[PDB]
Amino acid sequence: AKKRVYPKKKKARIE
Amino acid sequence: GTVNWSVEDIVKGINSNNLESQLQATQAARKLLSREKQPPIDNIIRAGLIPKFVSFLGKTDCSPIQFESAWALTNIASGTSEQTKAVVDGGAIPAFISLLASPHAHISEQAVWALGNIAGDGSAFRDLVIKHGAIDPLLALLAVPDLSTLACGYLRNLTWTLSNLCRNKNPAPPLDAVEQILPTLVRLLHHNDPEVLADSCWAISYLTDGPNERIEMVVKKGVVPQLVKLLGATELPIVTPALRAIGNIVTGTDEQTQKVIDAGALAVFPSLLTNPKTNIQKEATWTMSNITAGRQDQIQQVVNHGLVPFLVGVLSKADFKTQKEAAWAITNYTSGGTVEQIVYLVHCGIIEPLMNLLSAKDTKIIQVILDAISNIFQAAEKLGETEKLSIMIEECGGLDKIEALQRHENESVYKASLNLIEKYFS
């Protein structure tokens, strides 16, 4: 009964 | 007109006292940095052009050069930490925060993008952007009656930059900054654009990943029902961050987990625990394990929703990480469950697959399996059916594996299986 414990971080504008 | 320029030509045009030549050179630099294959970011930085672009950002009398310099600096800051630091060292943060109030939407959007890159570099630059006072103008850009009147890409970029301002820990964002930003994230989370919804869910998952104070901050705003709704969404880009946020929330106190349960999240787990995406199955099993580690009424809620059979199935066949999360869930169940609940779990057919995973080559999962076995045997001793479970574990071929593990490298599993074999099979 014990408790425990992705998108782009940077983006370039490209054409 | 400005395609395939050389860095030498760009520097020559920037060093001229002609604003129009400077604009042409800046445009050429932007185009050169807007190629997918190997943008010469390092060459541009070495030429010492970042200060010039930062100075151009402030030429309100010439908005074209403002936009071009903003684009170039955005692309530069989108690279390594060294390049983002190069952009920041030129004083670009205050310039971009000033341009956030530009009368041209396509320039304020580029400022938002650049600040988002800078903040996304890490918690240091994030806190620095917050210190220069970006949250106020960023949120002012969203102070509209209906969010649908804004450009789709504009709103998407704003949401992404806000999410970046919410992300990263060690340290987490400033508590007062999170309090300032949360209402706008609630509003965006009720928006209808799928990409904006995904970014908002990611921001919420960022904010919910930490001490229970942050989880409480988020839950007090009443977004858990909307998070469950998005958990039921059809688009995986939206379901993933919503499930991450729900998992983070359930890692907190039993009262926050109960708030999550009341929203109806469990009713969505029949499909999440069988979702085609292995990552979704793993995340959902992790959430279920964190839920089974709570009070007994919550375990009974899990039972009533018919999720014990789904946990059995996940433990029987799934990616090994999902199976480990399921083993953790079963161990928490047996540790905090009611004798009747352990009986029901065993009746659902968990013993055979739980011994099947005893052949795993990971010491931690074997320890968890044996800890759950100890819990179940204690329940059986209480109920007086220890011999029944002994015969069960011996019939499915698991006690063979326990005898084998009796001579295991790790001492914890060694002692656990030894105690089991000596106290139940002698």
Author numbering:
A (entry chain B): 120 to 124, 148 to 157
B (entry chain A): 72 to 497
Quoted from the paper:
In the classical nuclear import pathway, the cellular transport protein importin-α (IMPα), binds to a cluster of basic residues within a cargo protein known as the NLS. The Cap gene of AAV encodes three capsid proteins that share a C-terminal sequence and combine to form the shell-like outer structure of the virus. Studies have identified four basic regions (BR) in the AAV VP1 sequence. We recently reported that an AAV porcine strain (Po1) contained a region of the N-terminal capsid domain that is able to act as an NLS.
Here we used a similar method to gather further data and structural evidence to determine IMPα2 binding in the context of a larger portion of the AAV Po1 VP1 containing residues that span the positions of all three N-terminal BRs. Rebuilding and refinement allowed for the structure to be resolved to a resolution of 2.6 Å and refined to a Rwork/Rfree of 0.21/0.24 via iterative cycles of modelling and refinement through COOT and Phenix programs. The finalized model consisted of 426 residues of IMPα2 (72–497), 15 residues of AAV Po1 Cap-BR (residues 120–124; 148–157), and 25 water molecules. The AAV Po1 Cap-BR was observed to bind within the interaction sites typical of IMPα and NLS complexes, with both the major site of IMPα (ARM 2–4, P1–P5 sites), and minor site (ARM 6–8, P1’–P3’; sites) involved in binding interactions. A high-resolution structure demonstrates that BR1 (QAKKRVL125) interacts with IMPα at the minor cargo binding site, and the BR2-like NLS region (PKKKKAR155) we previously identified occupies the major site. Lys152 is the predominant binding determinate of the major binding site by interacting with the crucial P2 site and forming hydrogen bonds with IMPα2 Gly150, Thr155, and Asp192, with a classical salt bridge formed between Asp192 of IMPα2 and AAV Po1 Cap-BR Lys152. In the minor cargo binding region of IMPα2, the expected canonical ‘KR’ motif of the AAV Po1 VP1 BR1 site can be resolved, indicating that the VP1 capsid protein indeed interacts with the host IMPα via a bipartite NLS. With Lys122 interacting with Gly323, Thr328, and Asp325 with an additional salt bridge formed with Asp325, this forms the P1′ binding site. Arg123 occupies the P2′ site with a hydrogen bond formed with Asn361, and a hydrogen bond and salt bridge connecting to Glu396.
